[PDB]
């Protein structure tokens with residue numbers, strides 16, 4: 001059994017970022033940029049009013065003036081010069097006419113005289129300062145400025161910046177394509193009604209398909225494979241040559257006489273490890289396979305026990321997906337938190353204990369912080385121990401009872417911005 | 423100007439959960455359950471071995487015994503009784519034959535005699551205890567137990583539990599459908615190359631489409647609408663009758679003479695507010711419209727300034743989407759953090775200052791915690807102030823300089839499990 005830290009380092013060293021591709025603006029969302037983005041023109045590209053009001057010559061000061069033009073957009077006020085003793089109406093974002101050097105917001109003005117008469121006049125009620133409420137050319141974004149860089153993940157504001165810069169085709173790192181299969185003569189499809197003797201519904205495959213969908217990767221569902229070496233070899237050979245980047249199997253990695261995942265991965269590629277010092281998920285197998293005349297394919301022989309399967313996905317597969325997708329920081333978020341109840345650690349293996357965590361105004365020590373509740377019994381066959389679990393507490397192998405109020409490290413495994421509040 | 427707390431309470435009171443629908447297993451991912459889920463059979467449904475090894479009568483103890491059957495799945499060992507003085511081979515998950523009451527893992531056994539001879543014999547090397555390494559019927563899930571409840575959000579483990587229970591069609595609350603449009607005579611499509619005088623690319627629409635896609639809602643893109651009252655009325659009437667649940671407009675809510683969003687929403691429905699005491703995003707308008715002979719449609723007249731547009735989406739629209747989608751806890755995650763640099767608060771309006779936050783082993787006070795860096799100048803026209811921003815610091819309206827190391831409340835606006843580590 002190699003430590004988890006070493007297993008993660010091995011996976012990281014073998015995992016390579018995928019070749020970049022060109023995608024459309026909305027396909028770029030969630031992906032990591034593979035090129036810098038420079039603004040082709042300034043923002044604003046023209047001097048723009050911050051307010052609805054009047055563009056003035058600041059030195060004129062308070063008084064009554066004729067309104068010589070109106071400027072809201074496009075060519076409004078083109079060729080008109082605001083000279084001392086005149087003003088122009090402007091709306092927010094409107095081009096400032098030549099000659100005007102400040103804007104007086106409409107609340108500091110009063111329209112004078114009958115509206116019916118063509119000559120519009122306005123009283124400016126304050127003494128403004130040059131440059132007031134004007135956005136000079138490029139004050140928000142300078143022409144040729146780098147607005148986004150290589151290695152930056154694209155969220156909603158980054159899509160907004162791409163649109164600002166007129167970019168609708170984007171160079172990004174793609175997400176890996178993942179093949180998933182289940183193994184076992186005891187499995188039946190999850191559509192089964194009454195179960196026959198010695199049968200269970202395949203739950204890992206749908207759980208892993210959902211887990212991969214949450215990571216925004218395309219899934220190739222290869223179904224249930226029986227405990228037959230030739231059949232599993234055929235499906236693995238078909239998966240490796242299909243074009244996928246990652247293969248996830250579950251089950252068939254214990255010490256049974258019909259567990260063929262480990263020997264087949266040894267035969268097809270290079271197995272870096274098959275045993276990890278952790279609770280749950282000891283039989284985790286990792287291999288690199290080269291596809292026939294090519295590309296490399298990463299294979300995770302995940303444990304069959306449902307808890308172990310999902311915990312290994314969260315700890316080892318998620319950072320691999322992110323590394324392949326070009327993330328510079330693929331590691332999960334780790335925080336420090338206080339236990340709401342006592343927890344016994346294992347005497348030999350460090351445990352990834354499932355918990356429901358929340359941020360509290362008082363974490364028990366008189367200062368705000370995260371707190372955690374266990375999901376109960378941690379047996380690897382008990383998928384209910386993963387239910388609602390948004391974190392894995394990292395319990396060292398001391399064998400002692402960690403009392404309520406003691407502090408531990410925890411890996412956050414589900415969208416921290418989707419955390420239910422205290 | 424009403425306080426943000428009051429604006430949020432108004433939006434919450436008007437926002438109603440959508441009628442539930444029936445979806446397929448993979449469509450249920452990310453949605454909130456609208457029914458409880460009970461296990462139709464136990465897990466395991468038969469007494470199952472935890473190990474690869476031999477099923478024994480525990481009272482026999484160490485000795486040499488004939489192997490009378492092999493049990494891995496299905497009907498293996500059906501009709502065979504393990505009597506005192508006999509054992510049966512089992513694999514993990516295999517049915518325990520009748521009569522056996524414990525499992526001795528293969529590492530505590532030794533096969534005796536020539537394999538060629540049909541009579542297989544094994545030496546049990548330890549004294550086991552009744553019930554060892556057996557999962558009794560229902561130890562993981564009892565038959566008829568509630569495995570998921572109404573109001574629970576479906577993640578990967580919950581998909582795993584639905585598959586365990588044989589549920590492939592699920593009753594859930596759906597996501598709202600959102601219509602989005604931009605307003606302005608100064609706008610051009612983001613595909614525009616050289617900009618004409620007084621033109622800018624429409625960036626809010628693509629930014630909002632991306633923001634809504636991140637919330638997993640269907641988008642109806644209604645494009646750019648000019649500053650013409652009749653045209654905007656036609657598009658709003660078309661949006662309201664289309665079947666969408668939420669309409670998002672941006673711009674056209676300032677004090678200009680061609681800003682028609684507020685008066686049109688007043689004309690079509692009930693405007694609850696049009697001014698909020700906050701920096702940025704003061705002109706935010708909220709309305710409830712009833713669709714023609716029906717359903718209610720929520721409308722947000724978002725500010726045109728890009729920062730204000732996105733901050734209002736994050737604070738007001740995201741919890742509305744979640745409430746409509748049946749979330750019991752729609753509020754965003756709020757944490758407490760320390761400032762990495764000084765920040766000046768505004769003297770009148772509480773500010774939602776954009777920051778890049780991270781968890782540190784030392785937050786500056788000698789204990790672990792979140793820390794924040796400002797994204798720089800906070801002007802509402804500067805979309806670069808949203809770039810990489812994963813939090814909004816809630817700065818009260820004191821007008822004082824908050825020194826580096828001081829603690830503030832912060833709203834987390836992007837997947838906390840996608841946070842780049844320190």
Ligand SMILES: Nc1ncnc2c1ncn2[C@@H]1O[C@H](COP(=O)(O)O)[C@@H](O)[C@H]1O
Nearest residue numbers: 182202203204251252254304305514515
């Ligand atoms: N797809 C699956 N869904 C649910 N349980 C499984 C699945 N695959 C294997 N198991 C169970 O996990 C345990 C370990 O399986 P294995 O790793 O094949 O020995 C056994 O109890 C199996 O029945």
Ligand SMILES: Nc1ncnc2c1ncn2[C@@H]1O[C@H](COP(=O)(O)O)[C@@H](O)[C@H]1O
Nearest residue numbers: 092093604624625626673674676726727
């Ligand atoms: N879709 C958009 N994209 C970028 N900027 C916008 C958009 N809509 C309005 N604006 C700008 O936001 C500011 C306020 O607009 P409005 O609310 O229409 O007065 C002005 O500077 C507009 O040019």
Ligand SMILES: [Mg+2]
Nearest residue numbers: 183184251252
């Ligand atoms: Mg198996």
Ligand SMILES: [Mg+2]
Nearest residue numbers: 605606673674
């Ligand atoms: Mg406008």
